[PDB]
UniProtKB/Swiss-Prot annotation, chain A:
Disulfide bonds: none
Function: Component of the ERMES/MDM complex, which serves as a molecular tether to connect the endoplasmic reticulum and mitochondria. Components of this complex are involved in the control of mitochondrial shape and protein biogenesis, and function in nonvesicular lipid trafficking between the ER and mitochondria. MDM12 is required for the interaction of the ER-resident membrane protein MMM1 and the outer mitochondrial membrane-resident beta-barrel protein MDM10.
Subunit record text: Component of the ER-mitochondria encounter structure (ERMES) or MDM complex, composed of MMM1, MDM10, MDM12 and MDM34. A MMM1 homodimer associates with one molecule of MDM12 on each side in a pairwise head-to-tail manner, and the SMP-LTD domains of MMM1 and MDM12 generate a continuous hydrophobic tunnel for phospholipid trafficking. Interacts with PUF3.
Domain SMP-LTD: 2-223
UniProt topology in membrane: Peripheral membrane protein
MF annotations from Gene Ontology: lipid binding; lipid transfer activity
Gene, per the UniProt record: MDM12
Keyword Acetylation: no
Keywords: Endoplasmic reticulum, Isopeptide bond, Lipid transport, Lipid-binding, Membrane, Mitochondrion, Mitochondrion outer membrane, Transport, Ubl conjugation
Official protein name in the record: Mitochondrial distribution and morphology protein 12
Impact reported for residue 21 to D: Does not affect function
UniProtKB/Swiss-Prot annotation, chain B:
Additional remarks: Present with 1070 molecules/cell in log phase SD medium.
Protein name: Mitochondrial distribution and morphology protein 12
Signal sequence extent: none
Organism placement in taxonomy: Eukaryota, Fungi, Dikarya, Ascomycota, Saccharomycotina
Organism, as annotated: Saccharomyces cerevisiae (strain ATCC 204508 / S288c)
One cellular-component annotation, GO: mitochondrion
PROSITE patterns, per database record: SMP
PANTHER family registered for this protein in UniProt: MITOCHONDRIAL DISTRIBUTION AND MORPHOLOGY PROTEIN 12
Length: 223, 227
């Protein structure tokens, strides 16, 4: 490709944007139900990073007709079909309050720190634009099995775009790293470490679901 | 900012884009009048590079009306970006030249010679307009151009930038450039050869600048269409 360094300070600040994303994500978190062992989940900080994705424009066409059906509830309009490969420094700092003991009740609360980072990604996205609104979406994973025999992704009767069989499609996100810091007080006993463990499992699944319902086809991010 | 790698291979081409630029640069060279010391100028190879510019968003607006009559020529919502572009990438031009030497006697000798233009410095204000269905890029100004003091907005059509376009009244889009020259090592001894080479390097420098002026600098512009 070719190396670009893009700065949009005057459109919206990195601070501003990061906090917009942070507020969405918090909106997803405080609107999902929480388990036994976690009492409070919130996004402390979000940082999109200084490292972006490798974008490969593969096709350019008119927007899909499902958009026109979406607005019937022209022209000028154009959709990009892009092969996006992200291996960057997106960082989500999440705070939580873990509930410690089965015995008796509510024995102790703990402040805990989780860090979602190093998000791996190879995927097919479409970015459509139609007066006025701009449309970004993650369609597929590049190595998803229903692209075999070179069948174009933009086929509406295809399984991709139909989304008739979500179970069979490989997850958009290929890699992820969730780390967890607790006070050195509690690194000693395994009960705490176990609760931490499935806290990170739960967080993994929660994030999985977030991207599924926000970014994955059929779920749209709209500007 | 944020680091992007953009690839437009699906639409040609690294080869075909390079060869297009090469063909039109050759078109410029073969159509420019030459000094006595250089007989022939030609483009051996062109390579846009793997390194692009640092782009900073500098406001946004609806496209200038000049576009719309340059389309009466022949739509909301079209849009124009005003960009601070800073290029110091790896653009590489390999140019062949025929050197004329006539020291003793007359037209004594001509010398196949090979020049390398590289490290093109650039810091400028560009505008990228998109109207159905066409995308228009043009380099308006140099960042440190004197008609940008007063903080007079560039997009003022009555302002000098956009209206004037006078040949020498705006600092050249191109700030820096480095030209190397390869000749037969048997000729590295003679000073006359080296001096002719120097004059050639300067002349080539100039030529390339005005080429980029005539191709990129407002009111000249580049068109990419989707049809
Ligand atoms: C900085 C890079 C400078 C590139 C040198 C300019 C090469 C060039 O001539 O580009 C034109 C040619 C296509 O334009 P045409 O419509 O065919 O004719 C232009 C006249 N209206 O190629 C380009 O457009 C390349 C544009 C350079 C963008 C640089 C990307 C980084």
């Amino acid at each position: 490709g070719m190396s670009f360094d893009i700065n949009w300070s005057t459109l919206e600040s990195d601070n501003r944007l990061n906090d917009l994303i942070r507020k969405h994500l918090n909106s997803y978190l405080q609107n999902t139900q929480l388990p036994s062992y976690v009492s409070n989940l919130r996004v402390l900080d979000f940082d999109l990073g200084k490292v972006g994705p490798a974008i490969t424009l593969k096709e350019i066409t008119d927007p899909l007709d499902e958009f026109y059906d979406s607005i019937r509830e022209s022209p000028n309009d154009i959709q990009f079909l892009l092969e996006v490969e992200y291996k960057g420094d997106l960082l989500v700092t999440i705070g939580a309050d873990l509930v410690l003991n089965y015995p008796v009740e509510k024995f102790m609360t703990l402040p805990v720190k989780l860090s979602i980072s190093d998000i791996g990604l190879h995927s097919l996205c479409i970015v459509a634009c139609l007066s006025k609104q701009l449309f970004l979406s993650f369609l597929c994973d590049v190595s998803d099995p229903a692209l075999d025999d070179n069948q174009t992704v933009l086929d509406p009767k295809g399984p991709i775009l139909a989304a008739t069989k979500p179970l069979e499609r490989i997850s958009i996100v290929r890699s992820m790293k969730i780390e967890t810091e607790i006070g050195e007080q509690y690194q000693g006993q395994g009960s705490v470490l176990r609760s931490v463990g499935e806290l990170e499992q739960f967080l993994f699944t929660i994030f999985k679901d977030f991207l599924r319902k926000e970014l994955a086809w059929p779920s749209w991010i709209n500007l």
